[PDB]
Design a protein around this ligand. Sequence first.
Ligand SMILES: *[C@@H]1O[C@H](CO)[C@@H](O[C@@H]2O[C@H](CO)[C@@H](O)[C@H](O)[C@H]2NC(C)=O)[C@H](O)[C@H]1NC(C)=O
Ligand SMILES: *[C@@H]1O[C@H](CO)[C@@H](O[C@@H]2O[C@H](CO)[C@@H](O)[C@H](O)[C@H]2NC(C)=O)[C@H](O)[C@H]1NC(C)=O
Ligand SMILES: *[C@@H]1O[C@H](CO)[C@@H](O[C@@H]2O[C@H](CO)[C@@H](O)[C@H](O)[C@H]2NC(C)=O)[C@H](O)[C@H]1NC(C)=O
Ligand SMILES: *[C@@H]1O[C@H](CO)[C@@H](O[C@@H]2O[C@H](CO)[C@@H](O)[C@H](O)[C@H]2NC(C)=O)[C@H](O)[C@H]1NC(C)=O
Ligand SMILES: *[C@@H]1O[C@H](CO)[C@@H](O[C@@H]2O[C@H](CO)[C@@H](O)[C@H](O)[C@H]2NC(C)=O)[C@H](O)[C@H]1NC(C)=O
Ligand SMILES: *[C@@H]1O[C@H](CO)[C@@H](O)[C@H](O)[C@H]1NC(C)=O
Ligand SMILES: *[C@@H]1O[C@H](CO)[C@@H](O)[C@H](O)[C@H]1NC(C)=O
Ligand SMILES: *[C@@H]1O[C@H](CO)[C@@H](O)[C@H](O)[C@H]1NC(C)=O
Ligand SMILES: *[C@@H]1O[C@H](CO)[C@@H](O)[C@H](O)[C@H]1NC(C)=O
Ligand SMILES: *[C@@H]1O[C@H](CO)[C@@H](O)[C@H](O)[C@H]1NC(C)=O
Ligand SMILES: *[C@@H]1O[C@H](CO)[C@@H](O)[C@H](O)[C@H]1NC(C)=O
Lengths: 49, 220, 49, 227, 115
Amino acid sequence: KYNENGTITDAVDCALDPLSETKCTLKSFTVEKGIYQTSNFRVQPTESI
Amino acid sequence: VTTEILPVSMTKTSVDCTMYICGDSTECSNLLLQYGSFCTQLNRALTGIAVEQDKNTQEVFAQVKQIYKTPPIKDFGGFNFSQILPDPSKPSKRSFIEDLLFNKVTKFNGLTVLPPLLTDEMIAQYTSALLAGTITSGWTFGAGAALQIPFAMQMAYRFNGIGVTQNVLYENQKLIANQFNSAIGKIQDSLSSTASALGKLQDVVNQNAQALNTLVKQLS
Amino acid sequence: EIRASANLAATKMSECVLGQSKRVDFCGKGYHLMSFPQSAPHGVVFLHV
Amino acid sequence: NQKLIANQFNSAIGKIQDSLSSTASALGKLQDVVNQNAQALNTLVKQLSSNFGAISSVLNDILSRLDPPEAEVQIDRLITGRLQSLQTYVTQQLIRAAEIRASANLAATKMSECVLGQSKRVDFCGKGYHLMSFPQSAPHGVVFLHVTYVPAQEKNFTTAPAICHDGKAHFPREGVFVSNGTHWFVTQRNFYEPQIITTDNTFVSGNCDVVIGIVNNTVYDPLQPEL
Amino acid sequence: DAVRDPQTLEILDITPCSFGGVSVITPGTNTSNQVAVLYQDVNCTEVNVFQTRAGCLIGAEHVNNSYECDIPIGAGICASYQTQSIIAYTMSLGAENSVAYSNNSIAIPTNFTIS
Ligand SMILES: *[C@@H]1O[C@H](CO)[C@@H](O[C@@H]2O[C@H](CO)[C@@H](O)[C@H](O)[C@H]2NC(C)=O)[C@H](O)[C@H]1NC(C)=O
Ligand SMILES: *[C@@H]1O[C@H](CO)[C@@H](O[C@@H]2O[C@H](CO)[C@@H](O)[C@H](O)[C@H]2NC(C)=O)[C@H](O)[C@H]1NC(C)=O
Ligand SMILES: *[C@@H]1O[C@H](CO)[C@@H](O[C@@H]2O[C@H](CO)[C@@H](O)[C@H](O)[C@H]2NC(C)=O)[C@H](O)[C@H]1NC(C)=O
Ligand SMILES: *[C@@H]1O[C@H](CO)[C@@H](O[C@@H]2O[C@H](CO)[C@@H](O)[C@H](O)[C@H]2NC(C)=O)[C@H](O)[C@H]1NC(C)=O
Ligand SMILES: *[C@@H]1O[C@H](CO)[C@@H](O[C@@H]2O[C@H](CO)[C@@H](O)[C@H](O)[C@H]2NC(C)=O)[C@H](O)[C@H]1NC(C)=O
Ligand SMILES: *[C@@H]1O[C@H](CO)[C@@H](O)[C@H](O)[C@H]1NC(C)=O
Ligand SMILES: *[C@@H]1O[C@H](CO)[C@@H](O)[C@H](O)[C@H]1NC(C)=O
Ligand SMILES: *[C@@H]1O[C@H](CO)[C@@H](O)[C@H](O)[C@H]1NC(C)=O
Ligand SMILES: *[C@@H]1O[C@H](CO)[C@@H](O)[C@H](O)[C@H]1NC(C)=O
Ligand SMILES: *[C@@H]1O[C@H](CO)[C@@H](O)[C@H](O)[C@H]1NC(C)=O
Ligand SMILES: *[C@@H]1O[C@H](CO)[C@@H](O)[C@H](O)[C@H]1NC(C)=O
């Protein structure tokens, strides 16, 4: 978040928690009430065959 | 009695544009990002559709604030509604006719389907309420409170509403009730035997199925 | 298209089922008395009396 | 009840102001349109920063760095990508416009049938029995204040489809027959106002051997006391 | 779809690893920074856990009492923020109200309001 003088005054770490993910998805530091799709769950491989 | 069939909703599909284009591919994903928001807005557009699908259902069925139910004694002046009222013995309390309707109308590519907010059971409760309201309180429940009225009297108003003096109803009440009951039986005979009877809803399903089959085949 | 159909269906529910229609052939051919809704897969079925 | 009605009306209007001035979501339907258009434009502009496979999203940087035999290739990539963006934008605007047009058609319909007239279409002009409506303007839209009549209090009355006098079956010309437990009255359907059952309130058709649920009472004849 | 193992000639089906959309259910950040997460179309296996038809809902308490729908999840389930914490419940379709129907009783309004 860049303020009127170009100073970064805040920030969201998009991988910190699910709320931060919503904030990054919506490109905002405020999230309105509701349900938002932000990502995709995928089971990862554990070994190669 | 005539039957009018209208689509209300369509399958709430959802496509993961990233997975669809670049399924589990880092190298592809990095190239996909050069197309900016295209992937993102495609997901947004489909989401918008999925959302209005619940809006559509609510607008059609959720027009009553209270859930009305018929009395244990089904005395409607000779009018037999047992085939349109919910059947308590079923795992899903739907009417006989509704079951007929439901019995006529019928993956890993990032293509999924979301459930509706209102399940068939919820819809059945809404139609039950609207129907119970219609039968026991006429239109008063639509305007405000459900005000009980004898069914035969309700019909008297319905007749005045078409320019026929209400004495006609009472004098011919038995005939009218018999014609009504017969007409309902005719509806069942048609619906249970004519598959094309629900073509308007089946066509919607078919179009959506084709759209998805087309989308998947394009991957090849 | 579906939305337009849903809007029509909602209109009928409000004017045909909850009320009595004075609109010719809106609630089937003939002089409308009453109607009863029935649910269906992805839609609504009206029995117009 | 003119004074009561006027007071309820005036109160209801005050309630509208209290809601509108404090509930931002009250006008969500118009704000949403604005938001969708803003997003469509923001999306369109942001797309200019995309490379679409080009060495740079900036056209001047391609031209200042490559000679035509190579610059043209990089430019073609930007042109194709940006045209796809405009086509997407326009298609969305056309579809969205269709939705707005449909809404406008509905709004125009309501203006003509609800505001200029009186609606007989149930829940077309709000829940209740429509009386009148008043339009108000709003950013990119119209707001209708629908004034409706809604039954508030009710009582349980005993009823009958018809009344027997001398064997003749008497039916109401208007209203229904009611009973308070000792006396039968005839009254209008939407507002209890019991009247003495007379030959000027009812009409005769057929007889007591036909009507189901017909009850015994008397029908007053205003002429007999005059003769 | 399936392969024949090159060393042992048996046929193995290939089922792509479980995946699904992830949605965050939240009251506005003006009220609370607590969230619940819905894993769409998955079982509560690979991922205060409530299994619903729409997916695996984590962080929302399952409440037996129904209420008016607030933030919809799907398949009859809605979530809200109440006593505060995030809860999930089967949505109510409205209050139940029988009609005192009989063949000889009519309810007639005696008063009205203009709204
Ligand atoms: C309403 O109509 C149904 C038929 O659709 C009647 O149910 C039948 O009743 C007879 C006599 O008891 C039985 O032999 C049939 O097997 C029943 N059929 C079904 C499908 O249940 C019902 O009795 C009628 N109700 C009223 C009040 O008239
Ligand atoms: C109006 O038409 C109905 C039929 O639609 C007549 O009722 C039928 O009368 C015959 C005898 O002529 C009976 O066998 C049928 O069973 C009756 N049908 C029903 C449903 O009851 C009715 O009599 C006619 N009325 C007039 C005045 O002509
Ligand atoms: C119909 O209801 C209205 C209220 O909606 C009643 O009017 C109120 O009467 C009380 C006294 O009982 C006063 O204190 C209020 O100020 C009145 N309100 C208004 C707007 O005037 C009215 O009396 C009722 N009529 C009947 C027949 O019950
Ligand atoms: C039904 O309505 C009638 C008419 O208002 C009531 O009869 C009157 O009751 C008053 C006392 O409240 C007497 O002064 C009148 O002389 C009565 N009129 C007649 C014609 O008898 C009657 O009491 C009401 N019945 C019930 C059960 O409320
Ligand atoms: C309404 O009043 C009439 C009399 O005016 C009642 O008629 C009687 O009916 C019974 C049963 O058929 C006969 O045995 C009597 O002889 C009839 N009386 C007369 C004078 O003919 C009628 O039953 C009453 N109905 C109601 C609902 O009270
Ligand atoms: C920018 O700097 C001025 C001082 O020159 C200060 O008054 C103003 O508040 C600053 N703006 C922001 C957003 O910090
Ligand atoms: C009518 O009587 C029934 C049964 O006692 C009661 O439940 C209902 O509330 C009464 N309605 C009115 C308006 O008095
Ligand atoms: C009304 O219902 C009661 C109870 O079943 C019955 O005894 C009475 O005869 C019925 N009257 C009419 C007109 O149907
Ligand atoms: C939102 O936060 C502001 C403080 O910035 C507060 O005044 C307002 O009442 C809050 N609104 C709600 C609904 O909590
Ligand atoms: C999750 O897996 C169990 C078996 O361990 C099964 O019984 C249950 O029905 C599954 N639930 C869902 C939603 O698939
Ligand atoms: C609902 O009540 C039943 C008892 O009838 C209990 O077993 C169940 O755990 C309760 N569920 C919740 C979410 O409270």
